[PDB]
């Protein structure tokens, strides 16, 4: 009945997708020169944790970064010195996410209790203290990013996203159109709109203000394990678990490059473009990271510093460093 | 060779490091236990005998040990996602129906067997011993493969043999027991299994595989 009409509409939408694919970015830029072997030396080793670290986020200063572990700690590192500014003892050790406000006075992390805590750093008493506890979700919380000093965003394991309101502790909006579990999201350079992954090999482009998905790209194969916007907020290269990173076009509405290499068969676990939008970094389950060429797809220098799988990595705001975190419980600030 | 304030920051870093070390030391002296099992099959009984919408952590103790039993049963997502979080758990308690030889809910007994087979081959748990609690025995006293003797004490033995033979590794031993103990003997079985697991784990650190 209506399912047949939906399939017919999908046929039309895929036909439209194909009708505007004169180029591929592969034949173009063929004459463009490559980038020499990118060699990066482990500059600093931040070694404080005692167990696997599952997430981290770079502060706005490009100097302070926060990481979380199953040990039940949030240590606010200092990159230029390797010091520990703060150590926040968590309530539920099962933590699988972190954030950092554009201002330096808020940090949030909630992994498996279905609630994300909001912490206060710039407090008169001098001790970091919990500020709220958002408990509307019905599944394990995957990723959560601050939008402003208030209005956090979240995506949980029950196929929903929230866009909370910190002052009232209420779900102002609720995004729900996903068929399966949601595994990660990312905010655009401007906070106008964001995207989310899924476990059904699909991605959706939400709208922050009014709740409805605007576009759905289904060029992927197995899963989604990481998303991140390309600078200028138009591509948002996507992770994977089929060993094939991809980057779609928000305006052309179709997958574009599909980076891949035969030798590697592992699940990607994180991705984050570089400052100039030329490099595409990707942490792999194969115990070592990699650096791609965003415009030619050729591989580049390997980052074989770590021991166990890489879980999280992020380029700074100014692009002066690249931090990675593996289940070895060591953060390495490359450069 | 540092300024007036930087040395204070270094002192703060040292204090934080010492506090982290102290917290870590007193956290490896307790025993973890992941509690899996087919739903609606003798789980609440074990939990109750032992002593929000997610991980429920029971925190009992028994004879100088400090058990922390993470009863994960709330998540409705596929287990492939949050299972790896428990890769360093000293054991995986398991509860089966033992009453599914007749009901079909496919018989729950076969479903529990398949789940146990899946949990016994996961790459994460290829080294963690497993405990079986064949609970709901009083009511227990199809599945027609051989069952020749057909008696209670032979059907139970056959099912236990199936479960124990579902494993195929040499460095993980599967224990067994039946519940409905007069006292809190179920914890006693868990205590014995934990002691044996720790002994066998410390005997592999000095060679002597």
């Amino acid at each position, epitope marked *: 009945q209506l399912r047949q009409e939906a399939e017919q509409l999908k046929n039309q939408i895929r036909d439209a997708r194909k009708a505007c694919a004169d180029a591929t970015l592969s034949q173009i830029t063929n004459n463009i020169d490559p980038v020499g072997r990118i060699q990066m030396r482990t500059r600093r080793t931040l070694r404080g944790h005692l167990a696997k670290i599952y997430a981290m986020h770079w502060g706005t200063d490009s100097r302070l970064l926060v990481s979380a572990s199953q040990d039940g700690k949030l240590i606010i590192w200092d990159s230029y010195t390797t010091n520990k*500014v703060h150590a926040i003892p968590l309530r539920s050790s099962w933590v699988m996410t972190c954030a950092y406000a554009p201002s330096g006075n808020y940090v949030a992390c909630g992994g498996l209790d279905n609630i994300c805590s909001i912490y206060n750093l710039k407090t008169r*008493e001098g*001790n970091v203290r919990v500020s709220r506890e958002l408990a509307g979700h019905t599944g394990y919380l995957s990723c959560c990013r601050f939008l402003d000093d208030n209005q956090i965003v979240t995506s949980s394991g029950d196929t929903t996203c929230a866009l909370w309101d910190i002052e009232t502790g209420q779900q102002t909006t609720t995004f729900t159109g996903h068929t399966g579990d949601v595994m990660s999201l990312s905010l655009a350079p401007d906070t106008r709109l964001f995207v989310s992954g899924a476990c059904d090999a699909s991605a959706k482009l939400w709208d922050v203000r009014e709740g409805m998905c605007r576009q759905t790209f289904t060029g992927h194969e197995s899963d989604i394990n990481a998303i991140c916007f390309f600078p200028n907020g138009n591509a948002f290269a996507t992770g994977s678990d089929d060993a094939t990173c991809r980057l779609f076009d928000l305006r052309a509405d179709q997958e574009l490059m599909t980076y891949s290499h035969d030798n590697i068969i592992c699940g990607i676990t994180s991705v984050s473009f570089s400052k100039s939008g030329r490099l595409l970094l990707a942490g792999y389950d194969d115990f070592n990271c990699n650096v791609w060429d965003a415009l030619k797809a050729d591989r580049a220098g390997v980052l074989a510093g770590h021991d166990n799988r890489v879980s999280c990595l992020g380029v700074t705001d100014d692009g002066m460093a690249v931090a990675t975190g593996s289940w070895d419980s060591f953060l390495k600030i490359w450069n | 060779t540092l*300024s*007036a304030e930087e040395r204070a920051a270094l*002192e*703060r870093s040292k204090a934080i490091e010492k506090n982290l070390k102290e917290d870590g030391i007193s956290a490896a002296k307790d025993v973890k236990l992941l509690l899996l099992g087919a739903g609606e099959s003798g789980k609440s009984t074990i939990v109750k005998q032992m002593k929000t919408t997610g991980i429920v952590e029971t925190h009992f103790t028994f004879k100088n040990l400090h058990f922390r039993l993470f009863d994960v049963g709330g998540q409705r997502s596929e287990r492939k996602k949050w299972i790896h979080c428990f890769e360093d758990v000293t054991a995986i308690i398991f509860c089966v129906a033992l009453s599914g030889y007749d009901q079909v809910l496919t018989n729950r007994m076969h479903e529990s067997l398949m789940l146990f087979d899946s949990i016994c081959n996961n790459k994460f748990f290829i080294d963690t011993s497993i405990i079986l609690f064949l609970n709901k025995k009083d009511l227990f006293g199809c599945f027609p493969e051989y069952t020749g003797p057909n008696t209670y004490e032979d059907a139970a033995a056959y099912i236990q043999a199936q479960f124990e033979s579902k494993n195929r590794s040499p460095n993980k031993e599967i224990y067994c027991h039946m519940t409905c103990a007069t006292d809190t003997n179920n914890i006693q079985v868990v205590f014995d299994a934990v002691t044996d697991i720790i002994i066998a784990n410390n005997l592999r650190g000095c060679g002597l595989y």
Partner: single-chain antibody
Amino acid sequence: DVQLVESGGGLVQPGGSRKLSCSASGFAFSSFGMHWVRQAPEKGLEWVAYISSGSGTIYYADTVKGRFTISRDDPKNTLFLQMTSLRSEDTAMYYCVRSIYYYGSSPFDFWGQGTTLTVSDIVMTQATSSVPVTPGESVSISCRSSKSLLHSNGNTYLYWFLQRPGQSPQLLIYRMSNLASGVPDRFSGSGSGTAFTLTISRLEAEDVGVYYCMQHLEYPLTFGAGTKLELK
């Protein structure tokens, strides 16, 4: 609310001994660095002692070295100071402050009250102590050092403090470029690697106190001469 109060203020004779103390209740006192600062009937405002978070660092002022002892116990949130060989030069009212040192922190936040008692280094000067002024305009203070105050870390440790008449002072500007929370935006700070100055625009009926400037590049923090502002 945050408050620090003193315990022992009394009349003592030269050649005895007396012990000071304060009580803190509003914050997590167990992880703070507490200073001691003295004064005088004159504008004189000088450094006294110090104690760090873990009690592993204790500095002093050479003028009282070997006579003044400092110590505190975290569980009671109480600081103790012991004095001996009390000369008439010691007569002054002793303040007590707090300071927490980490990247991005503001030392010397909350200045408490003080007790009344009776009986090379860096040098800074503040010329033109007296400065007539009227409301509806800006002003400019300045204190100068004798050694470059710009450290290689990129920071320039220099603080400012305002003291209202009959009242303990409060932090005004730290590192000559940052404002302590709650201070209105009229105040501002700047300076080169050797010279420093403020710009207090739109003077109101409240900015009437005296100003001092601290140097923290070397731990014997030594303040500058007072620069009072009347309302001629």
